Amino acid sequence: SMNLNSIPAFQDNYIWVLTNDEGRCVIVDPGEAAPVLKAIAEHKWMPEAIFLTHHHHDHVGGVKELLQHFPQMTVYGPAETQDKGATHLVGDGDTIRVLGEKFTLFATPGHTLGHVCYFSRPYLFCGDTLFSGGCGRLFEGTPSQMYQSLMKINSLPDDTLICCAHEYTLANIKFALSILPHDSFINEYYRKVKELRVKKQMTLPVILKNERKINLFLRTEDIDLINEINKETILQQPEARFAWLRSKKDTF
Ligand SMILES: [Fe+3]
Ligand SMILES: [Fe+3]
């Protein structure tokens, strides 16, 4: 049984921390060490590991210093984080025992080529692959890769807690409303998210069952979304419509 905490970092990052009953924690994508060190001290956590989802600085920046403080830790990460301090390279389909729990790794290329997600039901650490109401910008991968990646995530159980790295939800939903302005779910979510954000409260994590109702990038096969896209371009291939939506989001 694990409990979830978050530590804000930089401007809109969250460093997720999962802790077991023994107070042992895994720290996910620590872009900044200081807030994590402070949190560890506050919670009297005993760090066991860091999970890295991808190589971006806002996810890995704090690794070296955290390792300096807690040399007992293993830093799990994909090959693309090997030079960012990963001490245990993880690949697609790997299972690892952390905090006494089993985490499944799956590759979710798109945002970066080597991006991975960590899943230990219900927790999904999906870094910058999926955001609430959105998905990672495709810095390295193709729309096809991200689409595949999103389908992998979407295949997870309804109760999956989406613990993505960024407070992008409000902007994501504003984008969503530019596509389906009258969508009941998205509008409801916009309302909820606006109130959280105005109160300076985080919008994460979110439950996948709900997330897929409001995330256009998880609604590629939704009739309503298809009908909307059809108003401007006819794209039979889901990857193409996902790509279209992603392109729209790129410039929104
Ligand atoms: Fe990133
Ligand atoms: Fe990021």
Q: Please, are residues 242 and 217 in contact by the beta-carbon 8 Å criterion?
A: yes
Ligand 1 center from residue 140 Cα (angstroms): 10
Instruction: For residue 54, give Cα distances in angstroms to 85, 125, 173, 189, 235.
Output: 11, 11, 24, 28, 31
Structure tokens at 84: 């960012």
Rounded to whole angstroms, what are the CA distances from 114 to 111, 134, 233? Answer: 9, 19, 31
Q: Cβ(67)–Cβ(202) under 8 Å?
A: no
Retrieve residue 183's tokens.
């969508």
CA–CA–CA angle 204, 170, 40 (5° rounding): 30
28 burial level (CB within 10 Å; 0-12, 13-18, 19+) = buried
Closest among 116, 109, 201, 204 to 160, alpha carbons compared: 204
Our measurement of the distance from residue 28's CA atom to the centroid of its chain's CA atoms, rounded to an integer in Å, reads 10
Q: Are 115 and 105 in contact (CB under 8 A)?
A: no
* 172 CA to centre of ligand 2 in angstroms: 15
Cα-to-centroid distance, 13 and ligand 2 (Å): 7
* Integer Cα distance of 224 and 85 in angstroms: 44
The sign of the dihedral angle between the CA atoms of 28, 29, 35, 41 is positive
Q: Of 3.30.460.10, 3.40.640.10, 2.60.120.310, 3.60.15.10, which CATH number belongs to 1-252? A: 3.60.15.10
Task: Please tell me the distance from the alpha carbon of residue 131 to that of residue 137, in angstroms, as a whole number.
Answer: 10
**Known binder of ligand: residue 250?**
no
CA of 185 to the centre of ligand 1 (A): 27
Cβ–Cβ < 8 Å for 129, 153: yes
- Taking the CA of 28 as reference, the closest ligand is 2
Q: Where are the domains of the chain?
A: 1-252
Q: Which of 130, 97, 113 is nearest to 105 (CA)?
A: 97
- Give distance in angstroms: CA of 53 to centre of ligand 2: 9
DSSP track, 187-217: HHHHHHHHHHHHTT-----EEHHHHHHH-GG
Would you give the DSSP letter of residue 81? G
Residue 69 marked in a binding site: no
Largest distance between two CA atoms of the chain: 56
Q: b/e map of 154-177 (b: 16 or more CB within 10 Å)?
A: bebeeebbbbbbbbbbbbbbebbb
- Enter the tokens of residue 31: 């872009």
Q: Are 121 and 1 in contact (CB under 8 A)?
A: no
Match 């389908």 to its residue by tokens: 151
Confirm or deny that 88 is annotated as ligand binding. no
Q: Could you tell me what percentage of the chain is helix, strand and coil, using 3-state DSSP and rounding each to the nearest 5? A: 40, 25, 35
CA distance 124 to 42: 24
Q: How does DSSP assign 88-107, residue by residue?
A: EE--TT-EEEETTEEEEEEE
> How was it solved?
X-ray
